[PDB]
């Protein structure tokens, strides 16, 4: 799941 500073 894409979230905060993360996209996986």
- How far apart (Å, rounded) are the C-alpha atoms in residues 1 and 5? 11
Beta bridge partners of 7: 2
Q: Give the chain's end-to-end CA distance (angstroms, integer).
A: 5
Please give the helix or strand (H or E) that residue 1 lies within, else none: none
The per-type count for the chain, helices as H runs and strands as E runs, is 0, 2
Give the side-chain half-sphere CA count within 13 A for 8. Answer: 0
Instruction: Give the whole-angstrom CA distance, residue 8 versus residue 1.
Output: 5
* Cα–Cα distance for residue pair 3/7, rounded to 1 Å: 6
Partnered with residue 3 across adjacent β-strands are 6
Half-sphere CA count of 3, side-chain side, radius 13 A: 2
Approach to solving = NMR
């Amino acid at each position: 799941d894409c979230f905060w500073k993360y996209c996986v």
